[model samples]
Each structure stands twice: as structure tokens, then as C-alpha cells.
Target: AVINTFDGVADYLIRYKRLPDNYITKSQASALGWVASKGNLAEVAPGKSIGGDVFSNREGRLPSASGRTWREADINYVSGFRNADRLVYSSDWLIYKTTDHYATFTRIR
Candidate 1:
């Protein structure tokens, strides 16, 4: 029901092209004392996930274009340290998924 996992998030992006209301920016979480390294999000922010930050494609893994900013979000969050599964989306509506901690990305919608 509430989109959070990889498949759920992917479908949401394909349909809404945006993260659901449950996703929160890094700053938002930090303001609430949510230490990502310790996965203290739940203790700080009752029901929010980390997301909505500009992803610098410096790894040369994902495609790059002028002025096309990419954003990242932690997917399938289930407590403890955040996993490698991330969703990278371009400002131009391009979306990609990564399960190996960004070692490789698969374009999906």
C-alpha cells in the first residue's frame, strides 16, 4: 500500500514520476536528529525515509547531460544502516535503479 520497496518505488516513479510523501530530504531527516549511518531515522522522524538530494554522477556510471540534475533516494528501507539499493532519477524524467550499491545501474522507465 505505502510505496517503499524497490518494486513499489519503481512503479510509483513510472506513474507519478516523483517520490511519495513518505520520502524526506536528507536535511529534513537530519534536522530531526536522524543519523543515517546509525539508521536512527525511525527514532527521530517517526515514518520518513531519506531522499530528495542532488546525486552527482561523478562515477561516470549513469548517463549525463548538461543541466540534467539527478536525484537519489534510499529504497526498501528496513531499519539499520541504509542499504545500497538506490533510485536515481534525472531532471529530464530519466530513471535508473541500482541494487549493488551503485556499482551498476539499470535504466527503467
Candidate 2:
């Protein structure tokens, strides 16, 4: 499922990064936006577009959608999966960051 709501987000963040001092930078915040400006507007809002055209003057972007741990599958799919699953899909960040785009999936069953 999704790490929706402020609390779930907080816990997810705290758990995933395993950083007691986890903090978001401008890029990090933008990455989150890259994930939010999406969805059907009735299901999810996975991406964002700044009228000021600050983030993506062209069109769209991809964000690092991380999780609690790691695996080969985590490295292989969740970023694209989450993007498509939610509606905002971009391969831009994979090129820009080159090594930062990542995700981790925790199986429920």
C-alpha cells in the first residue's frame, strides 16, 4: 500500500532511511513533488507542476520512492512501479541523478 497521511509518512520515512537525523533537501522536497503531481485527482496526487516553472519547465520528472529495506527487486522495479501505479511516471531522475533513483518494497504476504 501507500505511505499516505502525515503520520504514515513520518513513520515510513523514519523507518525506510534508517536515519535518526533524516532531513529533506530542496532536491529531496522536489523529488517528493515529482511523486505527488500525479494520480486521477480522485485517487492520488503523485506529482506537481509549479506555475513558476521552477521544477520542470519542460514537462515531468521521476522521484526516488524508497522503502524499509533493500533487495534485487527493490532496485529493479518499485520506482517505475509506484510511478505507473499512481500515474506520474518519468525516467528523468534516473538520468540526472544516475545513482540516486531507488525504491524498496515490503511484501505484506
Candidate 3:
């Protein structure tokens, strides 16, 4: 089943220890037909979201550490539109969800 909520997405990562193979990188989705500027992702990559994209955490909201990297997944995305909630996870297993586009995050694990 599709993970349709912030909690569900985070729980999925916690249980599987990684995003499923269905989670494709934005670039990979681009190859499949996604266009960020045009927002044509739904048409190009059906049932997919712009995931595996780097979350720089430039504002330092999340904990920092050397060799730690953050990846993001779109939360509650269906076929066409994407919600603001996003699942942001770190290489060290830090997982959280941002409801206001990173303005705030609630840690899941």
C-alpha cells in the first residue's frame, strides 16, 4: 500500500531501514518524464514523488554531523498535486516530518 501520511512514511523508513525501491531520485524521475519547473511529474512519473532529493539543512534546523546527509520525500502525494508535508531523513537514522516546508519538524524516530 502507498504510504499516505507523514507518520506512515517515517514508520515505513523505520521498519524497512530505507526507502523502498519504488522511491526514485528526482533525476531518475526526470529521465522518466518529470519536469520540476512545469510540475509535470504526475504525468511523467505516475504514482511517484520527487524523493531522494538532498535536504541541505542549510539553516541548521536539524542536528549536524560530519558525513551526515539528508534526503527528502514528498508526503501525501497522489497522482497530480503534492502536499507540503515532507519526510526528511538523515544518514544516521534521524527521521522527521515538516508540515510547513521545513519551517518546523516533528521527529518520528
Candidate 4:
């Protein structure tokens, strides 16, 4: 099951180096009839959460290194206009979390 909490998912990522089985990528969800505005992930794919979308570091907000790729996943997801909370992970095995949107980030692993 998806933890749906900051520490819960963070620890899961650090330990497994991947999102839980309850998670699905945006593209994958879309293929399964997921509508972003509708926020119907649960309705379409039962027990699934959103994640695995490539995080574009265009703003240079996160630290970058050669060949480093970043991906974003929702945390504490419930309903409505998805909250600002997200977990950003890197190809280098580093993980970060942001509570108040992406204004600031805390390293988790």
C-alpha cells in the first residue's frame, strides 16, 4: 500500500530506491484513462498513486550534475487540485522532499 505521507514515502524510496507498487507514472495513468483535472487515479486504477514523471530542472532549483536525471512523485495525495508536496529523486540515487511546493527542498537520501 502507498504510505501517502512524507516520511513514509521518503523512507520507502531510500530503502527500495523506487516508488511503491501502489504508484503509477503519469503516462501510464493516462493510458488507463486518467484525467489530471478530474484527479481520478483511484477511480481508474484502483489503489494506485501518481509518480514517475521526469522532473525538468529548467529553473535550476535542484542541484545538477553531469548525467543526473530527476523525477517527481506526489506525496500525501488525497483529492482535489493536488497539493504542492512532492518527492524528487535523481538518477544518482539522491532523494529530496518539498512541503511548501518547490520553493525549498530537503535532502532525504
- The residue pairs found clashing in candidate 2 are 35-46, 36-45, 36-46, 36-47, 37-46, 37-47, 37-48, 38-46, 38-47
Tens digits of per-residue lDDT for model 1, 26-62: 8988888877676557777878777777787774888
Report clash pairs, candidate 3: none
Best by TM-score: 1
Tell me how far candidate 1 lies from the true structure as C-alpha RMSD in angstroms. 1.9
Could you tell me how far off, in angstroms, the CA of residue 43 lies in candidate 4 after the best superposition?
Answer: 3.4
lDDT of 2 by residue, 1-109 (tens): 3333223323433355321122222244455544344432213222321111122213223334432212111111122332211111122211111123333212221
Q: What is the C-alpha RMSD of each candidate to the true structure, in Å?
A: 1.9, 16.3, 2.0, 1.9
Candidate 3: TM-score? 0.83
lDDT of 2: 0.25
Residue pairs with clashing backbones, model 4: none
Q: In each prediction, how many residue pairs overlap at the backbone (N, C-alpha, C within less than 3 A)?
A: 0, 9, 0, 0
Measured with C-alpha atoms, the lDDT of residue 53 in candidate 3 is 81
- Model 4 / residue 75 / CA error / Å: 0.1
C-alpha lDDT values of all predictions: 0.77, 0.25, 0.75, 0.78
Location of the lowest summed lDDT over 10 successive residues in candidate 2: 68-77
Worst ten in a row by lDDT for model 1: 76-85
Which stretches of candidate 1 lie above 4 Å from their native place? 37-39
